[PDB]
């Protein structure tokens, strides 16, 4: 079913879904490389208690690339330069009880664009659902820990201060990579990112990197000042 | 081994193979979006009985379609400039007994072109095969029901005048899909449809749709009048 | 790690590595289908008595295509038009002795091009490892039977002479191949083979063929008298 299109407003009204869906499609004229700072929001809301958010104001080109990682990846045609599908469970659609809904929301557009959003809902019904999370590297700090036990995916802000980023495995090693190790580790899982409308085809983005966290429990990064690095990890858990 | 080559003519001798083959390697020198209305048919003869037909004229795009669903996509070449290998057994080749051998001809084709037909055999030999059936909606009716119980893929005509399309799956649930929604469910399993000869991938022919079902019971198709629309269906069974 | 960058000169130092390593990065500014001469060989020196070699003057683009094969494919960058991932243990990493080492060379490369190597290490060791081995027809060679139990990979050079090819299973039956239909048999499995810098994909290189040997005993090979016919192929063992 059809959620709603957007044109000429730089923001979208707060969407209600009543009806259980299970994935989304985000349409667009700009194609994947072009988008700057569209964010999106998405949380279940229950009528008596407190809500439960999957998404608060992440980037739209982190939450397309956490979603299409591994066989797919994110398509085009003729009239929408900018097609992604982006799965909110695990094997079925939300159970909703009596009186959750689904609230989904669109922040920084740009006027002169068009925006399109789809749901998707399959016979199935799950309570497992996916939970996106942010994490921060400061400006002026040369080397920072963070902990990303339990999430299996993140998507990192890649920078030319980076220098090293050492791994820590569930057994206690420790090991050391560079930039280009990482990108070359990374797309040697998922080759291609993306399909272009002409027919080309591009291996992954020139400023954000994915990294599948399997196995590791700690990430060092060793840096130089001048800049923030930003993390978006994703973890699956029960509600 | 190769079975035969066609040109000048419009209608293929009818070819014999005593051999047992385990698949057909179909090339010829025009690109999958220009075939137009080849048709191919396929059957086993048998010495005393009656015939077992797999493939009874059916569309030479839907065929090659029905087949290289997946990991695998039409590849080109210097020389062809269109190769599909298209399997007739489970996991092995035709167990021919005492008296029988395939037959297989190529109908409506055109006077300046070329194809080429090529056999596969394997070591292993198996009872059960693919056999494809077709069915239609007719230019005039508004709402049809389709039976697609035991079927694992389906081939839609990809007309505009489709509108609504309805799945009913076997625990009883109904959904109800637009042709985008059906498109990209589509593409998120098998996004390569065919790789050209210059280089460019073509995600999906313009004018065929591939469905996968999987659990799935029955359709019921929605649309308005202008044009007839066709299901090319395969399945797997023991003979 | 950078291990080396060698450019200028037409062969390089013996270079040595002391950490365990896992895998190679070869990255260079050459196309994957403009290498013609280079080499690479690789050996460790046991503390213990007797040494191991895993590639012995290996051509550099049979050695890339013997460890790029399946999902994953050799890519490309804005700087280095070739970048490859060439795994030298099963799931670990080559595990050494106190004062052990792997030496690695280059020879027959180009004064005007650039060539960089990069060292994986990973927090699993191994004793399995990888070997690289040559084998040959000759000029005045009607036909040669190759055993290849215990392989699993090999890269044929193509050249007109050949006329068939048989493999004979580990059931005892034997099945005779065309160079068409094992070049047809190869690209079902393994769609793509690089991914070019513009955009642009290619499907396999035009004088080499990347043959998958699973459950195959034995090769036949025939072909008309006056060239040598070459194949590199690959096994995998515990030292």
Same mark, same amino acid.
Not at 110 to 116: C, E, T
């Given at each position: 079913?059809?959620?709603?299109? $957007?044109t000429?407003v =730089?923001?979208?009204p &707060?969407?209600?879904?009543?009806? /259980?869906?299970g %994935?989304? #499609?985000?349409?667009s004229?700009?194609?994947?490389?072009?988008?700057?700072?569209?964010?999106?929001?998405?949380y279940?809301?229950?009528?008596?208690?407190?809500?439960?958010?999957?998404?608060?104001?992440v980037?739209?080109?982190?939450? $397309?690339?956490?979603? =299409?990682?591994?066989? &797919?990846?994110?398509?085009?045609? /003729?009239?929408? %330069?900018? #097609?992604?599908?982006?799965e909110?469970?695990?094997?079925?659609?939300?159970?909703?009880?009596?009186?959750?809904?689904?609230?989904?929301?669109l922040?920084?557009?740009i006027?002169?664009?068009?925006?399109?959003?789809?749901g998707?809902?399959?016979?199935?019904? =799950?309570?497992?659902?996916?939970?996106?999370?942010?994490?921060?590297?400061?400006?002026?700090?040369?080397?920072?820990?963070?902990?990303?036990?339990?999430?299996?995916?993140?998507?990192?802000?890649?920078?030319?201060?980076?220098?090293?980023?050492?791994?820590?495995?569930?057994?206690?090693?420790?090991?050391?990579?560079?930039?280009?190790?990482?990108? =070359?580790?990374?797309?040697?899982?998922?080759?291609?990112?993306?399909?272009?409308?002409?027919?080309?085809?591009?291996?992954?983005?020139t400023?954000?990197?994915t990294?599948?966290?399997?196995?590791?429990?700690?990430?060092?990064?060793?840096?130089?000042?001048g800049?923030?690095?930003?993390?978006?990890?994703?973890?699956?858990?029960?509600?």
């Amino acid at each position: 079913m059809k959620i709603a299109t $957007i044109t000429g407003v =730089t923001k979208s009204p &707060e969407l209600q879904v009543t009806k /259980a869906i299970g %994935a989304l #499609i985000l349409s667009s004229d700009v194609a994947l490389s072009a988008l700057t700072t569209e964010k999106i929001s998405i949380y279940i809301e229950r009528g008596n208690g407190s809500n439960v958010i999957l998404a608060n104001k992440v980037l739209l080109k982190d939450f $397309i690339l956490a979603s =299409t990682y591994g066989t &797919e990846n994110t398509q085009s045609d /003729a009239d929408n %330069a900018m #097609i992604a599908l982006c799965e909110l469970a695990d094997e079925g659609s939300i159970y909703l009880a009596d009186k959750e809904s689904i609230k989904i929301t669109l922040e920084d557009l740009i006027s002169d664009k068009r925006y399109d959003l789809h749901g998707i809902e399959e016979p199935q019904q =799950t309570n497992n659902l996916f939970f996106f999370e942010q994490k921060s590297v400061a400006s002026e700090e040369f080397n920072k820990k963070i902990d990303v036990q339990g999430f299996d995916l993140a998507i990192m802000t890649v920078d030319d201060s980076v220098s090293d980023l050492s791994y820590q495995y569930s057994n206690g090693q420790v090991v050391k990579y560079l930039p280009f190790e990482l990108q =070359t580790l990374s797309r040697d899982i998922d080759p291609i990112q993306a399909v272009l409308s002409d027919g080309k085809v591009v291996q992954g983005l020139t400023d954000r990197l994915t990294l599948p966290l399997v196995a590791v429990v700690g990430i060092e990064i060793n840096k130089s000042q001048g800049s923030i690095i930003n993390f978006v990890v994703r973890c699956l858990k029960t509600v």
